[PDB]
Amino acid sequence: MKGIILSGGSGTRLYPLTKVVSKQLLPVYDKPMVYYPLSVLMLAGIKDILIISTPEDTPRFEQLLGGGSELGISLSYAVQSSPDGLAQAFIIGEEFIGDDNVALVLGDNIFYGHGFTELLQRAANRKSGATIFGYNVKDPQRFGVVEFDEKGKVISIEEKPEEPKSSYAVTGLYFYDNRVVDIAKNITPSARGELEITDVNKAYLELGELHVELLGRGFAWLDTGTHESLLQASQFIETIEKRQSLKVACLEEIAYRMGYISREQLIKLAEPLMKNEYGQYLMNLAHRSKDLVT
Ligand SMILES: O=c1ccn([C@@H]2O[C@H](COP(=O)(O)OP(=O)(O)O[C@H]3O[C@H](CO)[C@H](O)[C@H](O)[C@H]3O)[C@@H](O)[C@H]2O)c(=O)[nH]1
Ligand SMILES: O=c1ccn([C@@H]2O[C@H](COP(=O)(O)OP(=O)(O)OP(=O)(O)O)[C@@H](O)[C@H]2O)c(=O)[nH]1
């Protein structure tokens, strides 16, 4: 499975934060926002990942993350010249996808909770259809809204409905089989002038092949849409990390835990960062007994 992080857009709502910085390089507490959705794909077992951003910002993501070899993965980059919609990811990414199945995650979405990896790995395992993730939000009209029956079968999906049919938003993580690329080429722009992921999902729903995993109330799903919500997301991650000996979305740690890189390789990453707490954390992990790490 391949993965794509869609990490463009103007971040209009966060102005002036986004005048000269990409929204997905802004902090969520202690790390750039993009580390969080990247860590999600990594934990899904996805090792071939394309990062899409603006003509100005794409070089900066590449400066941040590099080609992935440090992390035992492959990262590639592509430019979206104008933010013409989520579903344009599969058009830009057509050559990258090839014949493979693909997951899309939004560069501004933060998922957190116990058992998430197991849901991701199950979605990544599922060779046919589309899997989307529903979450009970306060204002479902702000999002895509998925309506499901008593067995969790999808009945409808609607982008920002005036009268929502459920309280479950469609979060910014989507798993598709290879049909998605041709689907994306055949949808047309909405009233807001975008190629809509909801219309990709509706194509799968027409075929009876849209599947929803519901993320229950024990999961946290944030987006970093506004100044307020961004600060809230930071506060949430700070609470979790302050209490624990473990970090969230520490990419090098995940590379090591997933066996993508060795203890020796992790030491080599930690060395030039020993001047800071992040390096120290990595070095403590690399020297930790292999039994304790398991
Ligand atoms: O062409 C684009 C369009 C958007 N984005 C980025 O993608 C993210 C999502 O965009 P919005 O915040 O505008 O979200 P939408 O209103 O497009 O909502 C979309 O994402 C939601 C989850 O956060 C729901 O899944 C919804 O159904 C889906 O349409 C933003 O960071 C945006 O900057 C791009 O990089 N390129
Ligand atoms: O090395 C890691 C592992 C996990 N995570 C993040 O921690 C959260 C929980 O990750 P899991 O989905 O592994 O659940 P958990 O660790 O609470 O449960 P155990 O299986 O360990 O008992 C998920 O949000 C995941 O993204 C990291 O950020 N880094």
What order do the helices and strands come in, and which of them pair?
Layout: E1 2-6, E2 27-28, E3 31-32, H1 35-43, E4 48-53, H2 58-65, E5 74-79, H3 88-92, H4 94-97, E6 102-106, E7 109-112, H5 116-125, E8 130-136, E9 144-148, E10 154-159, E11 168-176, H6 180-186, H7 197-206, E12 210-215, E13 220-223, H8 227-243, H9 251-257, H10 263-270, H11 277-286, H12 290-293
Parallel strand pairs: 1-4, 1-6, 4-5, 8-12
Antiparallel strand pairs: 2-3, 6-11, 7-13, 8-11, 9-10
This protein binds galactose-uridine-5'-diphosphate and uridine 5'-triphosphate.
Uridine 5'-triphosphate is lined by residues 39, 43, 112-117, 248-249, 253-254, 257.
The CATH topology name reads Spore Coat Polysaccharide Biosynthesis Protein SpsA, Chain A
Strand share of the residues? 15-25%
Helix content: 25-40%
CATH level 1 name: Alpha Beta
Q: List the helices and strands in order.
A: EEEHEHEHHEEHEEEEHHEEHHHHH
Bound molecules: galactose-uridine-5'-diphosphate, uridine 5'-triphosphate
User: Main β-sheet: number of strands, strand sense, barrel status?
Assistant: 7 strands, mixed
Binding site for dTTP 1: 8, 10-13, 80, 83, 85
EC number: 2.7.7.24
Binding site for UDP-N-acetyl-alpha-D-glucosamine: 8, 80, 83, 85, 108-109, 144, 159-160, 170
Catalytic activity: dTTP + alpha-D-glucose 1-phosphate + H(+) = dTDP-alpha-D-glucose + diphosphate
